[PDB]
Amino acid sequence: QEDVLAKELEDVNKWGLHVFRIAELSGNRPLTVIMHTIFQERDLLKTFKIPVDTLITYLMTLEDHYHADVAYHNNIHAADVVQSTHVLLSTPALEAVFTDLEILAAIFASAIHDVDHPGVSNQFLINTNSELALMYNDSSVLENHHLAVGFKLLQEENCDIFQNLTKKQRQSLRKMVIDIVLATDMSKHMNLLADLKTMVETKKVTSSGVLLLDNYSDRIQVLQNMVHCADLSNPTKPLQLYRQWTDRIMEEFFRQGDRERERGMEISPMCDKHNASVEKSQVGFIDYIVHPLWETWADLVHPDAQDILDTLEDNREWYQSTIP
Amino acid sequence: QEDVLAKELEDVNKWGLHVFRIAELSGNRPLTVIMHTIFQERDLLKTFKIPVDTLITYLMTLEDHYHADVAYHNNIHAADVVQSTHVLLSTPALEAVFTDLEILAAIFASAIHDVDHPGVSNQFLINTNSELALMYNDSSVLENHHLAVGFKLLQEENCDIFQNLTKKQRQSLRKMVIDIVLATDMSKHMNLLADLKTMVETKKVTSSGVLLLDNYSDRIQVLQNMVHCADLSNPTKPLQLYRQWTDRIMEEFFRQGDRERERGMEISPMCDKHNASVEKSQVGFIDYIVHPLWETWADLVHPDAQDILDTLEDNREWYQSTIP
Numbered sequence: 001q002e003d004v005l006a007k008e009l010e011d012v013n014k015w016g017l018h019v020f021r022i023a024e025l026s027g028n029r030p031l032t033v034i035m036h037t038i039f040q041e042r043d044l045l046k047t048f049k050i051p052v053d054t055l056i057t058y059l060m061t062l063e064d065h066y067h068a069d070v071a072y073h074n075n076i077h078a079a080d081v082v083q084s085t086h087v088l089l090s091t092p093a094l095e096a097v098f099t100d101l102e103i104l105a106a107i108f109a110s111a112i113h114d115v116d117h118p119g120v121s122n123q124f125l126i127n128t129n130s131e132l133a134l135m136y137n138d139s140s141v142l143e144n145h146h147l148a149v150g151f152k153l154l155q156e157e158n159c160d161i162f163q164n165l166t167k168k169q170r171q172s173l174r175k176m177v178i179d180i181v182l183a184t185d186m187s188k189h190m191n192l193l194a195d196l197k198t199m200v201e202t203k204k205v206t207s208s209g210v211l212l213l214d215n216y217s218d219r220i221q222v223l224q225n226m227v228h229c230a231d232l233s234n235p236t237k238p239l240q241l242y243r244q245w246t247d248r249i250m251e252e253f254f255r256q257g258d259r260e261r262e263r264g265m266e267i268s269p270m271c272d273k274h275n276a277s278v279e280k281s282q283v284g285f286i287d288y289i290v291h292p293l294w295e296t297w298a299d300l301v302h303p304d305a306q307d308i309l310d311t312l313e314d315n316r317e318w319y320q321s322t323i324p
Numbered sequence: 325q326e327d328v329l330a331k332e333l334e335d336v337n338k339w340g341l342h343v344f345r346i347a348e349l350s351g352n353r354p355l356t357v358i359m360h361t362i363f364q365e366r367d368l369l370k371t372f373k374i375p376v377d378t379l380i381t382y383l384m385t386l387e388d389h390y391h392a393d394v395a396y397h398n399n400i401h402a403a404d405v406v407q408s409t410h411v412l413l414s415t416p417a418l419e420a421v422f423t424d425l426e427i428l429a430a431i432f433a434s435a436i437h438d439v440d441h442p443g444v445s446n447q448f449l450i451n452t453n454s455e456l457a458l459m460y461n462d463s464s465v466l467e468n469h470h471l472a473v474g475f476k477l478l479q480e481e482n483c484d485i486f487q488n489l490t491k492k493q494r495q496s497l498r499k500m501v502i503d504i505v506l507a508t509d510m511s512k513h514m515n516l517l518a519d520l521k522t523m524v525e526t527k528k529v530t531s532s533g534v535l536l537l538d539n540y541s542d543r544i545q546v547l548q549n550m551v552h553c554a555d556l557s558n559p560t561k562p563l564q565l566y567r568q569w570t571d572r573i574m575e576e577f578f579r580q581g582d583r584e585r586e587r588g589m590e591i592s593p594m595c596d597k598h599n600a601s602v603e604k605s606q607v608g609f610i611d612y613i614v615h616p617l618w619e620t621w622a623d624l625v626h627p628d629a630q631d632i633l634d635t636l637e638d639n640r641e642w643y644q645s646t647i648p
């Protein structure tokens with residue numbers, strides 16, 4: 001089984017990695033083994049003098065603080081977003097554009113971006129007067145929490161994977177990670193996409209043909225949108241993966257709706273298992289959210305993402321065909 | 325004692341209330357007795373069906389969570405900002421601008437806006453890796469905490485002063501209080517001032533000169549700048565009040581700078597007792613922060629802020645004359 005897992009991890013650079021099979025073959029440690037593989041691939045342990053035992057200890061502790069009993073927002077989703085961000089970071093249009101610290105920040109942000117997610121939305125936490133919403137004043141409630149847990153865990157025994165960064169490096173990384181994870185709040189999607197559209201319409205490329213990003217605001221915006229694209233990448237994956245992600249988000253949505261109904265609250269969009277259309281909801285999700293975002297990303301890195309966009313469009317056609 | 329306490333309270337509608345005497349005469353409960361008086365003056369207990377005993381129970385609990393060993397950011401400051409906001413809300417140029425719930429939100433926000441303040445700045449909390457900065461991801465660290473404490477205390481026994489507001493009133497009040505207290509973060513001063521300046525250049529008024537604010541984004545901005553003005557009202561008060569506030573903030577600054585020196589951190593501006601000029605600092609504070617703000621405010625409510633502005637310029641003249 002060890003050799004089987006290593007064979008599967010040879011695909012870590014490919015869109016459509018069989019992340020559910022890696023979860024099984026790793027003994028439910030997909031986030032740990034995919035993060036470890038990616039860190040080795042990018043030589044991040046040597047670059048940042050990260051002891052391997054500290055990396056594994058932190059990763060296993062982080063993975064533990066994802067909920068194994070939530071259908072979607074669990075360690076498999078975290079591993080998927082990490083691996084998807086890793087592929088997007090390798091896109092030719094971005095070659096040599098980001099520093100090693102920015103690459104570290106984007107991968108680390110992906111790894112922590114949903115940690116300790118309870119399987120219900122920000123609006124549900126606000127409307128039920130949850131402790132989380134009281135702590136965070138109704139503002140990016142989950143995403144502030146994911147950050148606080150992700151950084152707090154660095155303080156557990158032999159968990160500080162950043163122990164050999166300089167003070168300046170730690171300060172820069174912390175700021176970038178916060179900026180990235182807060183941008184995964186779905187209520188910021190329209191603003192993030194509008195800014196990405198503006199960058200595409202004003203795009204500049206260097207002599208080497210890669211994207212020209214010469215200030216913090218443009219650089220962090222690309223990293224924010226990259227991780228957001230990875231977070232919203234399920235419909236761009238091979239259909240057998242996409243359908244499993246749909247099965248899982250619908251389970252989480254329906255269980256939230258059952259709690260809303262039981263509390264006499266209005267049921268959230270797509271959360272009423274008695275009056276839901278899974279297929280129509282996926283087509284609308286693609287048409288109004290995912291394809292607008294990915295089409296814009298694909299324009300930013302053209303032609304690098306053409307195959308990802310082609311898969312998304314095929315999957316949209318397939319879900320549509322199950323309606324008629 | 326209670327009879328002279330009552331005579332001092334007769335000036336709750338005047339700039340330059342003797343708040344320090346009121347703190348002494350009330351047994352160190354200036355926030356409780358000033359809030360109570362203002363709620364009666366504005367008829368808020370009748371308007372919102374707030375039981376008196378619940379108002380007092382909450383106010384004393386809130387007052388208890390201000391620290392008695394911090395020289396400035398204690399319950400006397402909170403009482404002063406409450407009273408200052410109460411007077412600003414009575415500006416003639418604002419006579420019909422704000423609803424009763426908006427008035428309620430600005431006053432409640434003032435009362436809680438520094439609760440549980442540790443006597444050190446956000447930057448200190450960030451650069452020392454404090455628990456607060458870890459919880460709040462280095463963003464408006466103090467102000468998020470003041471809000472979380474202020475609202476959490478409403479859940480103590482007989483502390484829910486909003487129990488009789490409709491569910492929608494409570495939702496709207498919560499949103500406005502959060503928007504106001506978050507804007508008291510000093511790092512946002514220039515942005516707030518810029519928006520106030522834009523409001524002034526786009527100002528619309530009646531034939532009488534009363535402000536017309538149609539959209540929530542403009543109204544909440546005025547309320548944000550109003551509580552900010554009250555927070556920064558010490559140099560516009562009679563000199564013998566202002567001088568007491570200066571003594572207190574400088575004790576707080578010097579204790580923080582001693583902690584920064586000892587930790588080997590850069591010492592924050594105005595915090596090094598060995599190299600400080602209290603008087604030059606006050607004049608710079610007025611020239612670069614307090615007067616640009618209050619002069620912009622004065623223009624928004626022209627000419628009802630002229631006496632406040634005059635006093636500020638007089639106090640600036642006095643502090644400048646103490647520099648040889």
Ligand SMILES: COc1ccc([C@H]2Oc3c(OC)cc(CCCO)cc3[C@@H]2CO)cc1OC
Nearest residue numbers: 186189234245246249268269270281282285289
């Ligand atoms: C496989 O399908 C999915 C995978 C992931 C998603 C996620 O994206 C969004 C989202 O983005 C614009 C908005 C909301 C608000 C919903 C209000 O009820 C929810 C989600 C999901 C949870 O984070 C949704 C999916 O299908 C709808």
Ligand SMILES: COc1ccc([C@H]2Oc3c(OC)cc(CCCO)cc3[C@@H]2CO)cc1OC
Nearest residue numbers: 445510511513558559569570573605606609613
């Ligand atoms: C009586 O004197 C004072 C009374 C109150 C004050 C307060 O105002 C400011 C402030 O205003 C824009 C900026 C900072 C630095 C952080 C900016 O990110 C600190 C303070 C004081 C504490 O909140 C200062 C005083 O003197 C200097």
Ligand SMILES: [Mg+2]
Nearest residue numbers: 113114142184
């Ligand atoms: Mg999330």
Ligand SMILES: [Mg+2]
Nearest residue numbers: 437438466508
């Ligand atoms: Mg404050």
Ligand SMILES: [Zn+2]
Nearest residue numbers: 077113114231
């Ligand atoms: Zn996610």
Ligand SMILES: [Zn+2]
Nearest residue numbers: 401437438555
């Ligand atoms: Zn204050």
